């Protein structure tokens, strides 16, 4: 804990972003899931006309 605390206190936001993405990766590993988006969301932005 001491080592980590001395580590990450240079940019709180970046350590927040990372170590969260790897959480999603390691959590959604199992195929058992189902997920209901909406086409007007953000990640699927580039699916409209142009």
């Amino acid at each position: 804990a001491k080592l980590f605390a001395d580590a990450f206190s240079k940019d709180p936001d970046f350590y927040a972003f990372i170590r969260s993405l790897r959480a999603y990766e390691n959590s959604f590993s199992g195929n058992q899931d189902v997920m209901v988006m909406s086409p007007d969301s953000d990640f699927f932005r580039y699916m409209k006309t142009p």
């Binding site: 080592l3 580590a7 790897r22 590993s29 997920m35």
Partner: protein, 90 residues
């Protein structure tokens, strides 16, 4: 005969307790060493990665964002449906 066989059990069971006790202690020591070394590895990797992000902030990100979302949508069944929906009593 029963009394002496019970005495044999009494004199035999106790040492293996010392055996297993030493084993559990040594396994705890191994855990300690492994945890601290992994901590050093992670801190070093982040230390190396940070400055190049403090070089170019905006495009360091969206690449990482997309690269994680590719896998997160990789392994989940998905049902794309429009919104304004009312109810879903499966």
């Amino acid at each position: 005969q029963y009394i002496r066989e019970a005495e044999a059990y009494t004199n035999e069971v106790q040492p293996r307790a010392n055996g297993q006790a030493q084993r559990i202690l040594e396994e705890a020591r191994a855990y300690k060493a492994q945890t601290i070394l992994e901590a050093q590895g992670e801190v070093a990797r982040f230390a190396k990665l940070l400055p190049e992000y403090k070089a170019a902030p905006e495009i360091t990100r969206e690449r990482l964002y997309i690269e994680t979302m590719e896998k997160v949508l990789g392994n989940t069944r998905k049902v794309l449906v429009n919104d304004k929906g009312g109810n879903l009593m499966v």
